Design an enzyme around this catalytic site. Structure first.
Site, short mmCIF file in Angstrom:
data_model
loop_
_atom_site.label_atom_id
_atom_site.label_comp_id
_atom_site.label_asym_id
_atom_site.label_seq_id
_atom_site.Cartn_x
_atom_site.Cartn_y
_atom_site.Cartn_z
N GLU A 1 0.74 -1.10 -0.16
CA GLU A 1 -0.15 -0.17 -0.17
C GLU A 1 0.98 1.13 -0.02
O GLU A 1 1.13 1.94 0.84
CB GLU A 1 -0.78 0.01 1.22
CG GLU A 1 -2.23 0.98 0.79
CD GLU A 1 -3.09 1.17 1.87
OE1 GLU A 1 -3.67 2.11 2.49
OE2 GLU A 1 -3.68 0.11 2.49
N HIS B 1 1.68 4.49 -2.27
CA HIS B 1 1.11 5.18 -3.06
C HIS B 1 2.11 6.46 -3.80
O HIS B 1 2.90 6.75 -3.27
CB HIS B 1 -0.11 6.07 -2.53
CG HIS B 1 -0.95 5.36 -1.71
ND1 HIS B 1 -2.00 4.40 -2.27
CD2 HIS B 1 -1.25 5.12 -0.33
CE1 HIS B 1 -2.58 3.86 -1.50
NE2 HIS B 1 -2.18 4.21 -0.38
N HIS C 1 -9.45 -0.43 -1.43
CA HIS C 1 -8.50 0.73 -0.48
C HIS C 1 -9.97 1.54 -0.14
O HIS C 1 -10.86 1.71 -0.82
CB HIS C 1 -7.70 1.24 -1.24
CG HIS C 1 -6.80 2.30 -0.94
ND1 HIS C 1 -7.22 3.86 -0.84
CD2 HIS C 1 -5.70 2.34 -0.06
CE1 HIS C 1 -6.35 4.18 -0.09
NE2 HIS C 1 -5.41 3.67 0.40
N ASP D 1 1.55 2.07 3.91
CA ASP D 1 0.67 3.44 3.49
C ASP D 1 1.54 4.77 3.08
O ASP D 1 1.02 5.81 3.27
CB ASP D 1 -0.30 3.70 4.53
CG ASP D 1 -1.71 4.28 3.86
OD1 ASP D 1 -1.81 4.63 2.66
OD2 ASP D 1 -2.61 4.48 4.82
O1 LIG Z 1 -4.90 4.80 3.25
N1 LIG Z 1 -4.98 5.79 3.88
O2 LIG Z 1 -5.36 5.62 5.27
C1 LIG Z 1 -4.49 7.07 3.36
C2 LIG Z 1 -4.61 7.08 2.09
O3 LIG Z 1 -4.36 6.25 1.04
C3 LIG Z 1 -4.62 8.42 1.45
C4 LIG Z 1 -4.95 9.59 2.45
C5 LIG Z 1 -4.81 9.44 3.90
C6 LIG Z 1 -4.19 8.00 4.35
O4 LIG Z 1 -4.37 7.90 5.59
MN LIG Z 2 -3.47 4.08 1.73
#
Ligand SMILES: O=[N+]([O-])c1c(O)cccc1O
Ligand SMILES: [Mn+2]
Ligand SMILES: O=[N+]([O-])c1c(O)cccc1O
Ligand SMILES: [Mn+2]
Lengths: 332, 324
Positions: A8, A10, A164, A287
């Site tokens: 995860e 990004h 997601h 994340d």
């Molecule tokens: O997954 N998330 O929790 C996360 C994101 O992918 C995008 C915005 C905030 C965040 O904490």
């Molecule tokens: Mn995320």
């Protein structure tokens, strides 16, 4: 622990970048922006410094899921996936890609997933919850009947689908009105995603396509804690559950789901998930860039589990699930 | 284990009975309505047989919280409470009462809680989430400013408030459209109740009235699992959270909340709660008659915890909390 795999993780294109503005204070946007846009440089240095070998990369949120004209959604997804393929190609020992998909249109999504897997070498898809489509008065969830041919394609390709989060639409968010602090990762992301996942399980999708693999971040968005109660509430009643699926919700959770550790660096929560779904179905993830790589890795390095399970969750489960130690990935 | 105290233990009056009809299949309604209406007979025999000394009794759901006319809501609450006091008086060693409250009108609710506690001997209040009022365009949540003088009264009386579930209103429940199986205890109850609690915590209500005691059923409606994430998401960002409360959400959870075991007879879930909020803040409860007493007691008898904690969760913690 070197050799970890994280999924995860990004990035953004200039086209999708502004979707992530709003998730941090203004003073912090320059940093977040810089992390989102960087794939080749600092990201890999942090990977080296914190024992991550492979990031499976995905576009930021909601991105394609918020593009209400399905022709435009498809165009953005294709551009994002082509860009991601180019980036993977620059450091192919360190990166793999998940597909962005225009789920507005089941046929277009299925075609793009085929192209991403067969032509671009992607290893799965990542989708930010429900889709907005101008043609539909309602938000589009993937239990709805029109998606069943798309799922048949996912199972035939035999690649996982990462469901997601995104935020609920405002008309579906009134409980949070005046309490915007609960939106996003604090809470609303998890409710939205837990309910979407339960909609898939209840619909009977996994009776029809039993080899599907769905991934949830954030330790499964609360599901393990409440999974017993989902099926077993009012247990004295002997009845058939009023959903189309044949079996208990927990059966589909146990058989069709994987959970990642993204953004939920809490040992008690990990231990609960181990005792509910098992360490074989738990994957390390960070994340990044919404969470720090060093935060994720330092927590996981020392969390209170066996060394055998630390290797499985760190990399073994993901290497097996994404067939990364197989010939097609290593040599072709 | 004999001597247990249980405190999510429901009954109905004929006036509120039908509120419960949609929660079980048609074939099971006769059994359910007979359980709801019986206080003195089978209910006590089942307590005897399963080691419950005391049930703290509460009216079924949504009951008063769904009565849109606040005058009528207050009339219904008063009757239910008078009835409950009368029923408790018949077997005073076995029962206590929680108040039903006309939360539509903060003054009326405060007045009725005072009456129930000072005059009828009730040991707290139980409220089925948000209230509907004809006079309000929006559902009423108790973080809203007009309830703070009510909370001042709760703290002055020094009795707990049980924030029990109800379902969201249909326009706030579209995510479950075509998936009614998710409504009620399956899931929707917990989401609705977790967020109501969180709204309280983030509002600063517990900065102003720090001795408040809030009780949640169902092992805290998923809160313990995600509580770290509530405060610690995006931890690299150094910033003041955007809610009026001065401290972390977890500080109010740890200091002002207690959880019961109602309808959540799962050892893994209990242990996760133990390792988050601690066994001193967990209490045995059953959710009779929507759950069986035998299932609740038999699970709890044998769940994988210390004998010291089995005593505390079983009766010790509730004895201290309610000053029995
Ligand atoms: O997954 N998330 O929790 C996360 C994101 O992918 C995008 C915005 C905030 C965040 O904490
Ligand atoms: Mn995320
Ligand atoms: O708490 N509950 O979950 C419960 C009730 O108090 C009322 C209806 C069903 C049920 O399981
Ligand atoms: Mn109940």
């Amino acid at each position: 622990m070197n050799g970890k795999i994280a999924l995860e993780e990004h990035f953004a294109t200039e086209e999708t970048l502004m979707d992530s503005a709003g998730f941090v204070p203004d003073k912090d946007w320059p940093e977040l922006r810089s992390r989102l846009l960087d794939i080749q440089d600092r990201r890999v240095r942090l990977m080296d410094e914190h024992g991550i070998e492979t990031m499976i990369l995905s576009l930021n949120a909601p991105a394609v899921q918020a593009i209400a004209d399905s022709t435009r959604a498809n165009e953005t997804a294709r551009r994002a996936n082509d860009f991601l393929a180019e980036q993977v190609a620059k450091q192919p020992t360190r990166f793999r890609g998940f597909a962005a998909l225009p789920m507005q249109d089941p046929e277009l999504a299925a075609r793009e997933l085929e192209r991403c897997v067969k032509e671009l070498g992607f290893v799965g898809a990542l989708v930010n919850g429900f889709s907005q489509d101008n043609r539909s008065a309602v938000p589009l969830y993937y239990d709805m009947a029109q998606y069943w041919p798309f799922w048949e394609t996912v199972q035939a390709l035999d690649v996982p689908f990462y469901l997601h989060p995104r935020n609920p639409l405002p008309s579906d968010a009134r409980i949070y009105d005046g309490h915007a602090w609960l939106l996003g990762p604090t809470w609303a992301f998890g409710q939205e995603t837990a309910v979407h996942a339960l909609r898939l399980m209840g619909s009977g999708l996994f009776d029809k396509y039993p080899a599907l693999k769905i991934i949830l971040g954030h330790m499964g968005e609360g599901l393990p804690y409440s999974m017993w109660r989902i099926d077993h509430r009012n247990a004295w009643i002997k009845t058939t559950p009023k959903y189309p699926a044949k079996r208990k919700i927990v059966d589909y959770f146990n058989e069709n789901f994987y959970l990642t550790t993204s953004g939920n660096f809490r040992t008690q929560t990990l231990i609960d998930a181990i005792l509910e779904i098992g360490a074989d179905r738990i994957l390390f993830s960070t994340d990044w860039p919404f969470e720090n790589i060093d935060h994720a890795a330092d927590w996981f390095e020392n969390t209170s589990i066996s060394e055998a399970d630390r290797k499985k969750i760190g990399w073994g489960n993901a290497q097996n699930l994404f067939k990364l130690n197989r010939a097609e990935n290593l040599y072709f």
